[PDB]
Symmetry: D2
Subunit: 121 residues, 4 copies
């Protein structure tokens, strides 16, 4: 399995040790408190009240945890995924990213602690 | 595995199908939005700003997800637990509970969607 | 998980650390060479040519690996069990036993090397 | 997971649906009765009394179950593999094969029933 920190200010995202292959089943658990700028913190589901002003993922709130798998678009993670299977032709290294507007990561703070494992299949 | 809803207004908590036995390894993923009363919602980590005025679990925020295993005290769950093992002499049915002050559940709303599975061991 | 040897000459069998609980999924893999008395040795399926009379397990060949769960009757194991759930109401420690006629274990020789693990469930 | 039969008389072996990828943990359980020509049958460990000459796998007995991962050399399987990680740099489809001398498969008979699954990792 993989365990590590995803910094909210890391615009390129945190590459994991997990290479998602066809057929794989994965489980993700994400925890902790982070900010996209304000003097408040939100969990891995982000800020349900903040407008989307050009987020890297339009299917999750500002300040949410998302991922890319190889060459994929952003996929919501939020608090995690339980025994999850990717779409046809989605494969490669999993990168975890804090959901924010491109070029606005410099004022972000905090992190999420994330676990990923491959399940039985 | 078990999947189900934990209602924020359910003071007795939601009993699951998971009977935790000595040696078991479990994974929990919790998601969603709930309130302990106010016209705002919080995720399974609850409200980090709200004081503890007699919460059923003093190790988690008001509005967080917690659990009991058989005859145990409350144990924080928050967003989930990854490949977790219980203390010596903690065993029995897992019950999931919204963290609030006893007798104050009537104004709560929303729910968490929760998955629990037993891992390889 | 558990790994150990089951001696063919051990009439009482080898009690393991694995406690089979309701709902558990287990995998067993057994290997090696043993005899119920002749100079030949057989694997964990035993001797398909030997008559069935007086064996501790009528549903496996003489020289096969079998088990008990708690105080159950004998259950065939043979080369192993893949992601197995008990079809009967059984609970308790797994004991591994060589299948032979009671009182005839003293001329037996060799052993099986066995792995047991609990699977995801 | 994959379940199927490996015929002893099939020199090319049975290609499975399981693609072994770097880091995968697999479990294999094999059962049944087969012959490399004689009237006797043996289990998936084969015949411990048969000489080693000309077999497709020098590290297993004649009549044993072996495999290839992609275009690898033969790898012993015997009764199975418990939570196994490839110790060598191998990737690709698992092919299951009966261990015999090339060109001598036509007098073989019987089969092994095999389960393969990917384990948690
Ligand atoms: C149209 C517009 C106007 C103001 C901003 C803006 O200032 C801003 C700055 C951030 O650090 C930030 O994290 C976000 N966000 O999440 O939406 C917005 C961004 C876009
Ligand atoms: C000492 C005191 C004063 C006011 C209240 C109180 O009114 C209250 C009511 C709730 O529904 C509720 O969910 C909580 N809480 O989470 O703390 C407090 C509770 C205790
Ligand atoms: C050394 C040894 C140990 C066990 C056996 C053995 O299993 C055996 C011995 C007998 O006298 C017999 O009549 C039969 N039978 O009827 O199949 C089996 C045979 C030899
Ligand atoms: C009448 C009769 C027929 C078959 C057996 C018999 O099956 C048997 C099995 C053994 O493992 C064993 O060790 C021996 N023995 O050495 O005598 C006999 C035992 C008795
Ligand atoms: C029907 C059949 C099929 C295969 C065998 C067999 O494997 C065999 C045949 C031989 O002529 C021989 O010399 C040896 N050897 O040296 O061990 C083995 C024996 C019989
Ligand atoms: C010189 C020599 C010695 C041993 C073998 C031999 O091992 C063998 C193996 C077979 O599976 C088989 O089917 C046969 N056959 O029937 O001839 C022979 C083959 C050739
Ligand atoms: Ca920002
Ligand atoms: Ca309340
Ligand atoms: Ca005997
Ligand atoms: Ca042959």
């Amino acid at each position: 399995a993989w365990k590590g920190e995803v910094l909210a200010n890391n615009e390129a995202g945190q590459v994991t040790s997990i290479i998602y292959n066809p057929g794989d089943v994965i489980t993700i658990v994400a925890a902790g408190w982070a900010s996209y700028g304000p003097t408040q913190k939100w969990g891995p589901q982000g800020d349900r009240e903040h407008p989307d002003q050009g987020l890297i993922c339009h299917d999750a709130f500002c300040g949410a945890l998302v991922m890319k798998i190889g060459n994929s678009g952003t996929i919501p993670v939020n608090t995690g995924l339980f025994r999850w299977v990717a779409p046809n032709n989605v494969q490669g290294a999993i990168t975890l990213i804090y959901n924010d507007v491109p070029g606005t990561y410099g004022n972000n703070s905090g992190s999420f602690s994330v676990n990923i494992g491959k399940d039985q299949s």
